[PDB]
């Protein structure tokens, strides 16, 4: 059994440099060669380079030739990718992927880690109310948060039917928003109550937020 | 480098029909010799790592079910799948593990094609709580619709706007094949109540008209 887990998720301001560790075991690692691969948050992906234990690091794609640095230790097994200075297009996920040998396919992955470059704080968000043929919409505004993700549920996670939560959008002042929303008949409107509970962990805020109409 | 280019991007069919995909490359992937390419297929779903599904273009892995069957050769590959199930609904690569650089495709989204859906729009006004913090934020929603292409304009005072909502859209609904929409227009406090009447506009091949849902600030 052969597997690759990879270090947590990253929040930096464009300068520093940072490494991510691409661990593995399981039987025969020894032959595996290792490559990575980007995948922006809108795109797809884009291959970077691949590496071997053993140090034939030769190979690079030329839009990441001059960019970035990777690595290897035998000893531990993990293998690294280095930068030498962030922007604010190195936002992205990034994979490790295993193949056995010069010229064969990756077929096991690593989980990812996501890196954000923003050079921006971490700030707790604020939400806001949405109140409105039998079909009434109710939502939260999540408004203004960094860094990602946030969790948002309703009602107690009682509640799961009809209910929409966007991918978060990165605004002009740096920081995110999203909107969850659910449709509930008109003639419920007054007798239920309606409670969103939004988890930032990064900040370590936790809001409830009553929707009502009026 | 080799550069390879996946035939749709965008493709949409129906639940149990078949699917194609090719990629195209500007060298050869054979090497004559053991008469066998080296072009894998990924498959990647919203959230997760890809997984890979052929290897050298017919040679399926572990997990790989019976209904997806690769093909062609030299220059020009197929993926095939037989009969189309909801879990299949992903993005799919093809890349090269012949000459160093490596390449990836492109990206292919395969929808679950359905009777068109008109979208249930909804116009929300701001909070006061917002409006205490500065700032004014008019939500414009668009719920349960087909296809996906579809597109809302917001006008104040019906002057138009624009460049200053950002739009959000959420995948594909595994249980009734739909989508949903919010377009969030931004602005300040003091803009905010220098008009009136806040209209947000949509239009969809769903619907003959374009329907437009609008508010009147108070």
């Known amino acids: 059994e052969v597997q690759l887990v990879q270090s947590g998720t990253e929040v930096k301001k464009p300068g520093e440099s940072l490494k991510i560790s691409c661990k593995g075991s399981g039987y025969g690692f020894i032959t595996y060669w290792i490559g990575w691969v980007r995948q922006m948050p809108g795109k797809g992906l884009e291959w970077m380079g691949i590496?071997?234990?053993?140090?034939?690091?030769?190979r690079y794609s030329p839009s990441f030739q001059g960019q970035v640095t990777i690595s290897a230790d035998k000893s531990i097994n993990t293998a690294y990718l280095q930068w030498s200075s962030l922007k604010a297009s190195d936002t992205a996920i990034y994979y490790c992927?295993?193949?056995?040998?010069?010229?064969?396919?990756?077929?096991?992955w690593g989980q990812g880690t996501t890196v954000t470059v923003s050079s921006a704080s971490t700030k707790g968000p604020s939400v806001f109310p949405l109140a409105p043929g039998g079909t009434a919409a109710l939502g939260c505004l999540v408004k203004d948060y960094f860094p990602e993700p946030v969790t948002v549920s309703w009602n107690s996670g009682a509640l799961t039917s009809g209910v929409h939560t966007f991918p978060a959008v990165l605004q002009s002042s740096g920081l995110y928003s999203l909107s969850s929303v659910v449709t509930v008949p008109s003639s419920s409107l007054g007798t239920q109550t309606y409670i969103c509970n939004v988890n930032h962990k990064p900040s370590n805020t936790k809001v409830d937020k009553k929707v009502e109409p009026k | 480098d080799i550069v390879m280019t996946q035939s749709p991007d965008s493709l949409a069919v129906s639940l149990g029909e078949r699917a194609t995909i090719n990629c195209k490359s500007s060298q050869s992937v054979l090497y004559s010799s053991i008469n066998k390419n080296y072009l894998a297929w990924y498959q990647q779903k919203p959230g997760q790592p890809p997984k890979l599904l052929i290897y050298?273009?017919?040679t399926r892995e572990s997990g790989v079910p019976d209904r997806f069957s690769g093909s062609g050769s030299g220059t020009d590959f197929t993926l095939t799948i037989s009969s189309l199930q909801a879990e299949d609904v992903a993005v799919y690569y093809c890349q090269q593990y012949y000459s160093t650089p490596y390449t990836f495709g492109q990206g292919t989204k395969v929808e679950i094609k359905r009777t068109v859906a008109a979208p249930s729009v909804f116009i929300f006004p701001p909070s006061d709580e917002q409006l205490k913090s500065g700032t004014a934020s008019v939500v414009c929603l668009l719920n349960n619709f087909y296809p996906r292409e579809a597109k809302v304009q917001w006008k104040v005072d019906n002057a138009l706007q624009s460049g200053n909502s950002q739009e959000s859209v959420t995948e594909q609904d595994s249980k009734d094949s739909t989508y949903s929409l919010s377009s969030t227009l931004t602005l300040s406090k003091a803009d905010y109540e220098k008009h009136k009447v806040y209209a947000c506009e949509v239009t969809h091949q769903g619907l003959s008209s374009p329907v437009t849902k609008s508010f009147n600030r108070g």
């Open positions: 050298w273009a017919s």
């Open positions: 590496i071997y234990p053993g140090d034939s690091e030769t």
């Open positions: 992927a295993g193949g056995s040998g010069i010229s064969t396919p990756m077929d096991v």
